[PDB]
Every structure is written in structure tokens, then in C-alpha cells.
Enzyme design. Sequence first.
Site, short mmCIF file in Angstrom:
data_model
loop_
_atom_site.label_atom_id
_atom_site.label_comp_id
_atom_site.label_asym_id
_atom_site.label_seq_id
_atom_site.Cartn_x
_atom_site.Cartn_y
_atom_site.Cartn_z
N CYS B 222 -6.21 -0.86 -7.70
CA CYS B 222 -4.90 -0.90 -8.61
C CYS B 222 -5.37 -1.05 -9.91
O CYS B 222 -6.17 -2.07 -10.25
CB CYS B 222 -3.94 -1.84 -8.02
SG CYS B 222 -3.87 -2.11 -6.17
N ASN B 434 2.67 -1.66 -9.61
CA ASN B 434 1.71 -0.69 -9.35
C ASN B 434 2.34 0.49 -8.70
O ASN B 434 3.41 0.62 -8.54
CB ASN B 434 0.44 -1.27 -8.83
CG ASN B 434 0.41 -1.82 -7.42
OD1 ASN B 434 1.67 -2.42 -6.96
ND2 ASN B 434 -0.26 -1.66 -6.52
N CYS B 436 2.03 1.06 -5.32
CA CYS B 436 2.83 0.71 -3.97
C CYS B 436 3.49 -0.55 -4.43
O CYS B 436 4.01 -1.13 -3.20
CB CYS B 436 1.77 0.58 -3.13
SG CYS B 436 0.79 2.01 -2.68
N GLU B 438 3.14 -3.61 -4.74
CA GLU B 438 2.50 -5.04 -4.16
C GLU B 438 1.63 -5.87 -5.24
O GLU B 438 1.53 -7.01 -5.18
CB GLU B 438 1.78 -4.68 -3.02
CG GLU B 438 0.33 -4.35 -3.30
CD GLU B 438 -0.05 -2.91 -3.61
OE1 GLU B 438 0.90 -2.12 -4.12
OE2 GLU B 438 -1.09 -2.29 -3.06
N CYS B 459 -6.74 -5.06 -10.07
CA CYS B 459 -6.62 -6.14 -8.89
C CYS B 459 -7.45 -5.35 -7.69
O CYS B 459 -7.46 -4.42 -7.48
CB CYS B 459 -5.28 -6.08 -8.54
SG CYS B 459 -5.24 -7.44 -7.42
N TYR B 727 9.35 -0.95 -1.88
CA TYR B 727 8.53 0.49 -1.96
C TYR B 727 9.30 1.52 -1.20
O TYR B 727 10.42 2.04 -1.65
CB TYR B 727 7.32 0.30 -1.19
CG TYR B 727 6.05 0.99 -1.26
CD1 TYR B 727 6.05 2.21 -2.26
CD2 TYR B 727 5.34 1.16 -0.06
CE1 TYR B 727 5.10 2.75 -2.29
CE2 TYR B 727 4.35 1.97 -0.12
CZ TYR B 727 4.21 3.03 -1.41
OH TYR B 727 3.12 3.84 -1.27
N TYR B 728 8.75 2.23 -0.20
CA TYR B 728 9.20 3.33 0.41
C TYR B 728 10.76 3.16 1.04
O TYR B 728 11.13 1.98 1.34
CB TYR B 728 8.38 3.90 1.37
CG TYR B 728 7.10 4.75 1.10
CD1 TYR B 728 7.07 5.63 -0.03
CD2 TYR B 728 5.88 4.62 1.89
CE1 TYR B 728 6.07 6.14 -0.23
CE2 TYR B 728 5.00 5.07 1.44
CZ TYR B 728 5.02 6.10 0.18
OH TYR B 728 3.66 6.77 0.19
O1 UDP Z 1 -2.90 7.32 -1.64
C1 UDP Z 1 -3.34 6.18 -2.38
C2 UDP Z 1 -2.95 5.09 -1.68
C3 UDP Z 1 -3.19 3.87 -2.16
N1 UDP Z 1 -3.78 3.88 -3.38
C4 UDP Z 1 -3.93 2.44 -4.14
O2 UDP Z 1 -4.46 1.52 -2.92
C5 UDP Z 1 -3.67 0.38 -3.34
C6 UDP Z 1 -3.05 -0.47 -1.85
O3 UDP Z 1 -3.13 0.89 -0.99
P1 UDP Z 1 -3.60 0.75 0.74
O4 UDP Z 1 -4.25 -0.67 0.73
O5 UDP Z 1 -2.37 1.35 1.21
O6 UDP Z 1 -4.84 1.83 0.45
P2 UDP Z 1 -6.06 1.60 1.46
O7 UDP Z 1 -6.97 0.96 0.42
O8 UDP Z 1 -5.83 0.98 2.77
O9 UDP Z 1 -6.33 3.25 1.46
C7 UDP Z 1 -2.47 0.78 -3.92
O10 UDP Z 1 -1.91 -0.08 -4.87
C8 UDP Z 1 -2.84 1.91 -4.76
O11 UDP Z 1 -3.49 1.44 -6.05
C9 UDP Z 1 -3.82 4.94 -4.15
O12 UDP Z 1 -4.77 5.00 -5.30
N2 UDP Z 1 -4.05 6.04 -3.51
#
Ligand code: UDP
Lengths: 35, 734
Positions: B222, B434, B436, B438, B459, B727-728
Amino acid sequence: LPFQTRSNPIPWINTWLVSQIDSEVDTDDLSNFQL
Amino acid sequence: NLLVTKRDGSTERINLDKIHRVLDWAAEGLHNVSISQVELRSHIQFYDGIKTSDIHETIIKAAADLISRDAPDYQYLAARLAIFHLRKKAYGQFEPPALYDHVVKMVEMGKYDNHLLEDYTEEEFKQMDTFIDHDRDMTFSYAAVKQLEGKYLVQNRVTGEIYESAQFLYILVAACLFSNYPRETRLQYVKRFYDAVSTFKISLPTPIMSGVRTPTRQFSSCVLIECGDSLDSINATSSAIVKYVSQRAGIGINAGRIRALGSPIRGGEAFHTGCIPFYKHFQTAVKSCSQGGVRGGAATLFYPMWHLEVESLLVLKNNRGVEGNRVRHMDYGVQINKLMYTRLLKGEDITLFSPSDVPGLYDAFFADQEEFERLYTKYEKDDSIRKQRVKAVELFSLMMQERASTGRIYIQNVDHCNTHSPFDPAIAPVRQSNLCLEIALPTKPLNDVNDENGEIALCTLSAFNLGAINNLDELEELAILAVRALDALLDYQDYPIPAAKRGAMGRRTLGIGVINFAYYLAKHGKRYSDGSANNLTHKTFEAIQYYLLKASNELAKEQGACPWFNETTYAKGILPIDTYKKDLDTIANEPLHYDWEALRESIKTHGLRNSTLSALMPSETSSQISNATNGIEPPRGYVSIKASKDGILRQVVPDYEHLHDAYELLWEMPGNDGYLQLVGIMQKFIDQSISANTNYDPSRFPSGKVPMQQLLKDLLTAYKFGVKTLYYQNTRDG
Ligand SMILES: O=c1ccn([C@@H]2O[C@H](COP(=O)(O)OP(=O)(O)O)[C@@H](O)[C@H]2O)c(=O)[nH]1
Ligand SMILES: Nc1ncnc2c1ncn2[C@H]1C[C@H](O)[C@@H](COP(=O)(O)OP(=O)(O)OP(=O)(O)O)O1
Ligand SMILES: Nc1ncnc2c1ncn2[C@H]1C[C@H](O)[C@@H](COP(=O)(O)OP(=O)(O)OP(=O)(O)O)O1
Ligand SMILES: Nc1ncnc2c1ncn2[C@H]1C[C@H](O)[C@@H](COP(=O)(O)OP(=O)(O)OP(=O)(O)O)O1
Ligand SMILES: [Mg+2]
Ligand SMILES: [Mg+2]
């Protein structure tokens, strides 16, 4: 039963053996709230 | 009499016994699978000279698509077939090489980072090779393996060449993060952290999985950038986005400070073209690149609800307009506070201002809720200020309507993000979120790409597998391993933007979440909707926060608190158990089981190594490694269909055969109250926010249409229980 229990080794054979938005709003109902 | 082409280029006569042997091995020990099914569903088209590597990929696809409720074990048959194929792709054989021999060749090829050879000796590498258990690749599911070869394993993004295996990824991510640790305890941690992630106790995010061991060092998921009302800030914001999307990052942009369309510039030397032309510039910055070649660039833009252009910004994804005033490929988050919600409940109006015509109204909107109401009602009466009144019922209806149709119009309650946060709003307020919704961290806008004064919030993430723990006290050991590995990562990685390194080194903010929460509720025989999991959620997330705070508190004793710890509310001795929203007392009566007062004293004394620790992310991709249910969301079905770079993936819920009755699937829920209550309970302890989803089934409503009354009542219900962000909005169709 003379043999051990077993799942169907050829499951494919069974196919051959059997045939907007409701936009209305009520502020009074929402007013019955405390944030 | 025909010939197949082996992997080494040679040929031999086609022998179906070779295929029977492979499948019998992959089906060994599994229940209710069929070798015959996999071969026949392959529809394998033989021809003289057919490649043996293409043959194997066909039967993997066939076995993968046979994953069903009646045959859930195909998730392991297809996984074992996929691991076998992936061993050959990187090594040409089944057995992986030695850890040292591999790292040598890889650092030599420029695929690994150079430091691996400098910080570890050959005697140390051979000692970690004894930690590795390559048989743990046999505990993955097929969805996990496809995400490994698709996103995580080090590979060539033009060739497609796979270079490593799964267990090497784990042991080297452990090695690199603790590489800078003291040698008396270094390998002690490296083994422990490897065991934690290879046995699915801790989940690592995408950039850590695909990054930590590669030359390019960027592993923060993020990136939060704040944009000031100047061209120099807009130019700086754009440059930072381009750099970070190119390095595996999802952006959160705060373009609310930009003045409204028609405002004077230099006292009338120019007519302000508006926000939307700059929003379009932010979109091309995000879409110019890819996230390190792993996935595509995405970003969420934030603006206050009272902005003058708010009616034009709420419809930016709405396809029913010309391209000039449409910015479709970015998500948006509308910022709301208590006063805005009050105007709706009383059926009054909401006045819209440009942030340039209301001095101090913007900063008060976040940091000082009383000062906002003072300035707001004051400027509402001033007849000299440019304003625009809209019925609060109409403005809210437009927002939720655009939220419902796109699913990507998010909500951030800015007052909750500052009245119940780890930061002092007067010193470092939270002004955005950010991608998503969170993450909630402080930010200060930039005046240049290298402006030292601005702050970009980073983060770093990870998750606790709630299905893998047997006692909540296992989190004490897990929080130590997780916090230490992430805090070390902050010093290990690079920073393309100086303003971002300033925030990351100053506050050292972490974001540790949870996965497999739905399977966790199933094991305890609780559910989302009925509210039977309220006290269980309260007990669980108290332990998560307590052991996280404790771990960073002990790490503060060991290496010193974060430089800007004095700006946190933890520094003033304030804990989450003080600032939480009191309405939670009417939906949960679980008492605190841990000694928070001793923790309060120890934090007052020794501080925290990290300004934040907990944040509940969706873990869309990362949770699939442990075959866990993503984050806190309930699974869509017993067998969920999830997306992949190749195609579609079938993922079985964990422990389906013994727990298919205990699960409450997503669309089996009557409403959102039970879920939002659990989110509100979680938010009591989470430092940042939660990627809370709202779901609606049109068929559950009269005339098949979802009422605006219910969308708004749920939105107010979320605020009543202190939910920070939304979110969604999932809407069913089937
Ligand atoms: O398509 C995506 C999905 C997630 N994120 C980043 O990953 C963070 C947390 O997303 P998640 O943990 O669902 O992604 P993962 O790390 O599990 O792929 C979000 O705040 C985004 O900054 C992103 O850059 N692109
Ligand atoms: N003679 C053959 N005719 C048809 N298919 C074969 C033959 N030998 C192997 N296969 C199939 C079985 C496997 O599922 C798939 C992959 O086999 P694999 O053993 O990895 O290829 P290979 O034998 O050419 O490489 P390696 O030398 O690494 O064994 O090919
Ligand atoms: N302990 C084991 N671990 C992994 N795989 C095993 C094991 N025991 C048997 N197998 C299976 C996996 C392979 O499908 C098969 C042997 O693989 P492989 O070397 O490719 O033989 P093959 O049938 O392709 O002959 P060749 O490779 O000589 O053409 O046996
Ligand atoms: N020539 C222009 N055309 C369209 N928009 C502009 C132009 N110049 C600036 N803007 C926008 C971008 C900023 O959000 C806002 C002010 O930009 P900025 O660079 O701060 O102006 P400035 O400092 O020269 O004068 P002031 O800030 O007093 O208007 O107006
Ligand atoms: Mg072979
Ligand atoms: Mg200016």
C-alpha cells in the site's frame, strides 16, 4: 460383499447408463436512529 | 508407432503406461478420484512428435476442472501434478538442487539479490538447507500452486521461464528479512519463521512472496499519496504514482484538496479547468505500468463529500456519460463524517464548498470535529463564499446508487479514523485511505518528487491464519515472528520516493491481518448473520491486538521505538480499548482476558517499534496459498471460482467434508447486520481499518429490486458501530 468398499473408478460411465434500485426513501424511519 | 518429444529434446515411442504411473502417483491416498476421468477429460490430441511438457499441462488442466463438492480431493491431485511439472520447469528434474548451488547460479544470473552471498556463508546456507522440508510442497492445493507459478515464483515476464520452487521462496524470504540479525540468534529466527510460513501459520502478501530475494527491493503493498492544491504537488503526485505502480504497489490518492472547477487562479489570471482533468492525469499514471509484472496497476481516489464537484465525481465510473467527464478505471472513496450523516437523518440539505473558499474547513474535517461544525455552519451563512446546497437525501442516494452499480464507490468515515486511531489528530491526522480501504495512516502533501518535507504513507502486510491456530495464545509467538520479520523489512527494502521513506522510517507502520476467518467460525460452530460470533470475535481480536502490541513493545525494548512514536496516541498511554465506539457494548459482552493495564504501562515506558500493527486486508491472492477463506469474508460457495492469469481456478473450502454444514456461505446470509457487527467488534482493536464488504441479493427483495432504504440503513448501521471504511458492494446475479 466380497470386495472392499470403493468409490466408482469410472464415474463417466453413469452418463451412459442412466438418462434496479427502489429509490424511495423515508427520512422519518431513518430519523429513528442514533449514531 | 508414433513418437513423443521428451523434455530433453529426444524422442521415444508413445507409452500410455507413463501417464498411468504419473496419475496413480498423484491420486495416491486420495479419496473419490479417478485416473480414468483425468485421462478422458484431458481429450488429449496425440500427434507424431507431441511435446511431453504439453501433454502434462493438459492433464493438470483436466484434473483441476474436476474439483467438485462430490470429489474435493482433486484439489490435491491437480496440485501434486502441478508441483511435479513446476519442478521440471525450473530444474529439469524432480529433486531441487542444494540451497547454495541454486542461490549461486541465481545471483550469477541477476535473478536474485547480490546480498544473499555476502550476508550468508556457504556453511550457513547448508545449515538452512537442513531446515527445508521439500515434502511440504505436497500440502498445497491446486489454487495455491497456480498462484505460485503465476505470481510468486521468480520468473521471466517475457520468457515465462520458471526459475525456483516453493520451499526455496520460503527459506529465502526468511533468510533475507533476518539477514541483518545478530548471528547468535539469526538462524534461530530464520528456521522459526520459515516453519511458520511453510506450515501456513502466517500468510505473506504478494510483494513479499514475489519480491524478497530479487534485486529490485519494494515489498510494501500500500502506498498513500496526498496531493496539494498546486501544480507542483500534482506533478509530484503523478511522478510518485508512476514509480510505485511500477514496483508492485496499489495507490491511495487524496485529491480532495484540489480546488473546484471555475475557481480563480492567481486571482483570476486563469480559469480553473476542474478536478476531473487532473483525475484523468492520475489515471494514466496508474495505468502506464504494471505492478512489477505481477498484476495490473490500480488506485483509489478520495475526496470529501462536501466538495463542490462532488456530484460530478460520484459518477466518474458511470458509463452513461461522455469520456470528457468520465474517469472509469479508478476507484473512489467518499469521505463522510457525523455532520453529513446528521443532515440526512434530519432531511436537511448539505452545502458544497471548494476547499479553497473555506479556510481551515478541510483540516478540521479530519482532525477537529467540533472545529468543523463551527466553520461549516459559519461558512454556510456567509453569502460571499461560493457554495451549493443539495438535499442530503439526494446526495446520499446518488452516492449509494453509484456504489451499487459499479461496486467500487467506497466510504471512509473520517471522524472515526481520527477519534479512534493510533494517531494524534492534532499532530498527524488520518486524511485518506488506500486501494482496499483497510489502511489509515498519516500523510503530508509533496512539493516535488524529492521533497523532503512531504510524507507518503507506506504499509507492509501479513496475516494470521486463524484456521491454523489451536489456542489464541499461539499468537504471542506468532506476533513476535511476524512483527520482527516485517519491521526488519522496512530497513531491508529500497524507496523510490524520498517522501515515502520518511514516513516508513519515522512511523514504521505495519498492517497485520487475518485469513481463514469463515473456516474459523465453522470450527467454533458460529455464524455471521445470527450474531453468535460476537463474543467469539471480541475474544479473538483482543488477543490479536494484544499480542501484536506486546510483540512490538518488546521489540521497542530491544532496538528502540520508532522515531515519530511521540505523535501516536499510544505515546500518551491511550489504548484501543479506550477510544472505541461505545455502541459495541450493546452487541457484545465478552470481557477482556489479557492484562492491558500492564501493557499500557509498558508502552508508556518503552514505546512501540511500530506506530500501527493491525489492519484487515482482503488477501484476495495471498490467502489462497494456505487454501484459506480470504480475509474475514465468507466464501461464495463450497467450491469457489477464483480468477487467475491462465484462467479460472476451483478452490474448496478448508475441511469441507467435515464442516459443510458449519459454513454460512455469502448468499446464505439474510442481511448485513450480523457481518457489520462483527466488523465493528473487530474495529475495536484494529489500529487501521477493515476492507468491509456489503452484499445484497436482489431476489431477496420484493419486485426484485434492492431498496435505497436498505442501502442507507446498512450504511448508518456501519457508522453506528464505528466501522471506519466500506469496501466492495457485492450484488448477486444468478
Ligand atoms: O489487485 C490488487 C490487489 C491488492 N493490491 C494491494 O494489496 C493490498 C492488500 O490487498 P490483498 O492483501 O487483498 O492482496 P494480496 O497481497 O493478498 O495479493 C491493497 O491495499 C493494495 O494496496 C494491489 O495493489 N492490487
Ligand atoms: N513415452 C511417453 N509417451 C507419452 N507420454 C509420456 C511418455 N513419457 C512420459 N510421458 C508423460 C507422463 C507425464 O505425465 C508427462 C511429463 O513427463 P516427464 O517425465 O516430466 O517428461 P520427460 O520424461 O520427458 O522428462 P524427464 O526426463 O524429466 O522425465 O509426460
Ligand atoms: N517417491 C516418489 N516421488 C515422486 N514421484 C514418484 C515417486 N514414486 C513414483 N513416482 C512417480 C512419478 C513419476 O510419474 C514416475 C517416475 O517419473 P519419471 O522419472 O518421469 O519416469 P518416466 O515414467 O517418465 O520414465 P522416463 O522419465 O525414464 O522416461 O513415478
Ligand atoms: N494554467 C492553468 N490551467 C488550469 N489549471 C491550473 C492552471 N494553473 C494552475 N491550475 C490549477 C492546479 C491547482 O490545483 C490550482 C492552483 O495551482 P498553483 O500552481 O497552486 O497556482 P499558483 O500558485 O500559481 O496560484 P494560486 O495557487 O494562487 O492560484 O489550479
Ligand atoms: Mg520422465
Ligand atoms: Mg498555488
